[PDB]
Write a protein that binds this ligand. Structure first.
Ligand SMILES: [Cl-]
Length: 232
């Protein structure tokens, strides 16, 4: 009868100050346990697991309420980063790490926008901690990528902050949240002026170093991610 989903989501207030979760690809949800949990605050991103009972008395007026009542739980909030408009060169950062993936999506809520990005690593140690820099060149002209026109490129780089310990974890993922509000406003302005209804972007990341690890030699790229810039 009921089916569980897991989706990244933003915690936020509705227009009447109810705490809801706004999952990527789903409707807004009221989860009473999350709304009363001091681990969270509006603007946080989480991985939520939830179930909606479409036949409940609480969901009889969901259309007028503007949310579904759901049960579930969520992860700890994702680490938060700014989106930097200071592009970097190929020189390696201190304690820089190579990545093996960086899929992402722009999430929307009532009051916030966040890019959720999932940097992946060939290997990490248990309890390793990283910090990140998401940057881009605001003067860049978008380009055609694999048949998609006007694709913008963001860059994700990582630095090791804590070494961690054995055992080694392969193909480790470290979901993070990046501020998306000013990126959205800027790309909406550029792409609406170009007569477009969407924005297309990808995330590049370091794939290999040069021989002495002083520079990035090659880069990897995420799949293209898109979001609408049409509003009500
Ligand atoms: Cl967690």
């Amino acid at each position: 009868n009921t089916q569980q989903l897991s989706s990244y989501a933003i915690v936020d207030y509705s227009s009447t100050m109810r705490t809801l979760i706004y999952p990527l690809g789903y409707y807004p949800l009221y989860v009473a346990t999350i709304a009363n949990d001091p681990t969270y605050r509006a603007g946080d991103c989480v991985l939520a697991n939830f179930t909606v009972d479409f036949d409940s008395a609480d969901n009889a007026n969901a259309s007028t309420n503007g949310f579904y009542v759901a049960t579930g739980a969520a992860s700890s909030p994702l680490a938060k980063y700014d989106l930097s408009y200071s592009p970097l060169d190929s020189m390696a950062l201190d304690n820089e790490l190579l990545l093996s993936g960086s899929e992402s999506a722009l999430l929307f809520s009532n009051n916030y926008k966040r890019i959720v990005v999932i940097p992946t690593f060939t290997s990490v140690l248990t309890d390793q901690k990283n910090t990140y820099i998401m940057s881009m060149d605001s003067n860049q002209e978008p380009e055609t990528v694999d048949g998609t026109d006007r694709v913008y490129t963001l860059c994700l780089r990582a630095q090791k902050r804590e070494e961690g310990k054995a055992p080694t974890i392969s193909n480790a993922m470290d979901p993070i949240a990046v501020e998306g509000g000013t990126l959205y406003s800027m790309l909406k302005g550029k792409e609406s002026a170009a007569g477009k209804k969407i924005v297309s972007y990808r995330v590049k990341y370091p794939l290999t170093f040069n021989a002495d690890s002083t520079k990035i030699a090659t880069w990897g790229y995420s799949k293209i991610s898109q979001f609408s810039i049409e509003e009500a």
